[PDB]
């Protein structure tokens, strides 16, 4: 069926970051952190419509043999069903490594690349990712990069089935367990 | 809540410091000698003695309450200061992993030496004439 | 771990010092002659410095505890590593008992 993604987002200045990580190692599951390092690139298809189609492709540079990942994110639902999280339609697809070449045949062109380097935790269904967004200049190269800002970004995400309430309330409680350190909230993608 | 408990600790600390300072200042103020008028020296002196003793007792009580506050703060730190729990868990994990690895290296070397001895004994026993 | 706890231990000792400085100051004031009035001023400054830095340390630690409190019971643990270490030690003990038995049968064979 059609699965929905619930998002809460925020940010954290880096000099307080470690305390956040220590807080997360208390609250999230009994695991060591994951330290993911990913290359993300955004393709778009300039169809007839006013809205061009958008697709996100991620190659996990750090882990060899990890399948590439496609993600289609639907536009956010204006209905006030879950009032507190970004509720979107998510289609996530594991793929082989010729993907970009295949997408070049489908009519897609690139928009921007960015590295993302950070940590990954989980709590039940929830996925906490705390990462820094790295701008790539010299667009072919993945080493020539610069940090976008001083702050790290924090995302609390749950991918789950369409509708399916009592999900955003648990995300509210897990966000409120961090509220001195981070302010996580449903931020609209407009402006 | 945690916020409520921390506020309560702040209130207790402020109250204890205020009480010690007030009692000491009041003892010092009574220590002033003043000229008497309608107070009957003897009564004034006993009342002053009682006041000083009671204030000293109050100062000692405030010190005991400060000791209680320190103990409660120590308990809170030992129970839910997340960083130190993480360093304790990690140090415990690394120490136990090193002990496990030492035990397994000892066992593997034991197995190899015992296997060589078993080979010699098998040759001797099976090739025995009897 | 020893850092903040040793701070709490120091504040215990300084609460004792505050009470003793109160007592020493009124000790000097009760004297028939108290010549060392400069030392009375020194003990008074010692008393007030003790009370002030006790307040400073405890206020700082309540602030730091406000920064790292969560009200949640810390779901981390170290149980699995202790379990594996116990199994490794019992493997070693089993091998020790078996080696004792083999050595005992060897002594019985060589004994005759």
Curated annotation (Swiss-Prot), chain A:
Keyword vocabulary terms for this entry: Activator, Nucleus, Phosphoprotein, Transcription, Transcription regulation
A molecular-function term among this protein's GO annotations: transcription coregulator activity
Chain positions found as Phosphoserine: 51
Keyword Kinase included in the entry's annotation: no
Pfam family for this entry, one: Med18
Record-annotated membrane-spanning stretches: none
GO aspect biological process, one term: positive regulation of transcription elongation by RNA polymerase II
Subcellular location: Nucleus
Cellular component annotations (GO), alphabetically ordered: core mediator complex; mediator complex; nucleoplasm; nucleus
Top-level taxon of the source organism: Eukaryota
Assembly, per entry: Component of the Mediator complex, which is composed of MED1, MED4, MED6, MED7, MED8, MED9, MED10, MED11, MED12, MED13, MED13L, MED14, MED15, MED16, MED17, MED18, MED19, MED20, MED21, MED22, MED23, MED24, MED25, MED26, MED27, MED29, MED30, MED31, CCNC, CDK8 and CDC2L6/CDK11. The MED12, MED13, CCNC and CDK8 subunits form a distinct module termed the CDK8 module. Mediator containing the CDK8 module is less active than Mediator lacking this module in supporting transcriptional activation.
Function in brief: Component of the Mediator complex, a coactivator involved in the regulated transcription of nearly all RNA polymerase II-dependent genes. Mediator functions as a bridge to convey information from gene-specific regulatory proteins to the basal RNA polymerase II transcription machinery. Mediator is recruited to promoters by direct interactions with regulatory proteins and serves as a scaffold for the assembly of a functional preinitiation complex with RNA polymerase II and the general transcription factors.
Family in the record: Belongs to the Mediator complex subunit 18 family.
Protein name: Mediator of RNA polymerase II transcription subunit 18
Gene source species: Homo sapiens
Primary gene name: MED18
UniProtKB/Swiss-Prot annotation, chain B:
Gene transcribed to yield this protein: MED22
Parts forming coiled coils: 84-113
Main location group: nucleus
Family: Belongs to the Mediator complex subunit 22 family.
Parent-record interval covered: 10 to 139 of 200
Descriptive protein name: Mediator of RNA polymerase II transcription subunit 22
GO BP term, example: positive regulation of transcription initiation by RNA polymerase II
Function: Component of the Mediator complex, a coactivator involved in the regulated transcription of nearly all RNA polymerase II-dependent genes. Mediator functions as a bridge to convey information from gene-specific regulatory proteins to the basal RNA polymerase II transcription machinery. Mediator is recruited to promoters by direct interactions with regulatory proteins and serves as a scaffold for the assembly of a functional preinitiation complex with RNA polymerase II and the general transcription factors.
Domain of life per record: Eukaryota
Alphabetical keyword list: Activator, Coiled coil, Nucleus, Transcription, Transcription regulation
Subunit structure: Component of the Mediator complex, which is composed of MED1, MED4, MED6, MED7, MED8, MED9, MED10, MED11, MED12, MED13, MED13L, MED14, MED15, MED16, MED17, MED18, MED19, MED20, MED21, MED22, MED23, MED24, MED25, MED26, MED27, MED29, MED30, MED31, CCNC, CDK8 and CDC2L6/CDK11. The MED12, MED13, CCNC and CDK8 subunits form a distinct module termed the CDK8 module. Mediator containing the CDK8 module is less active than Mediator lacking this module in supporting transcriptional activation.
GO cellular component: core mediator complex; cytoplasm; mediator complex; nucleoplasm; nucleus
GO molecular-function terms, A-Z: transcription coregulator activity
Compartment list: Nucleus
From Swiss-Prot, chain C:
InterPro entries given in the database record: Mediator_Med11
Chief place where the protein resides: nucleus
Keyword Nucleus: yes
Biological process annotations from GO: positive regulation of transcription elongation by RNA polymerase II; positive regulation of transcription initiation by RNA polymerase II; protein ubiquitination; RNA polymerase II preinitiation complex assembly
Keyword Nucleotidyltransferase: no
Keyword terms of this UniProt record: Acetylation, Activator, Disease variant, Epilepsy, Neurodegeneration, Nucleus, Transcription, Transcription regulation
Subcellular location: Nucleus
Assigned GO CC terms: core mediator complex; mediator complex; nucleoplasm; nucleus; ubiquitin ligase complex
GO molecular function term, any single one: transcription coregulator activity
Pathological condition linked to this protein in its record: Neurodegeneration with developmental delay, early respiratory failure, myoclonic seizures, and brain abnormalities: An autosomal recessive disorder characterized by congenital microcephaly, profound global developmental delay, exaggerated startle response, refractory myoclonic seizures, progressive widespread neurodegeneration, and premature death.
Family to which the UniProt record says this protein belongs: Belongs to the Mediator complex subunit 11 family.
Entries under PANTHER family matching the protein: MEDIATOR OF RNA POLYMERASE II TRANSCRIPTION SUBUNIT 11
Protein role: Component of the Mediator complex, a coactivator involved in the regulated transcription of nearly all RNA polymerase II-dependent genes. Mediator functions as a bridge to convey information from gene-specific regulatory proteins to the basal RNA polymerase II transcription machinery. Mediator is recruited to promoters by direct interactions with regulatory proteins and serves as a scaffold for theee assembly of a functional pre-initiation complex with RNA polymerase II and the general transcription factors.
The name this protein goes by in its record: Mediator of RNA polymerase II transcription subunit 11
Organism: Homo sapiens (Human)
Designated gene of the protein: MED11
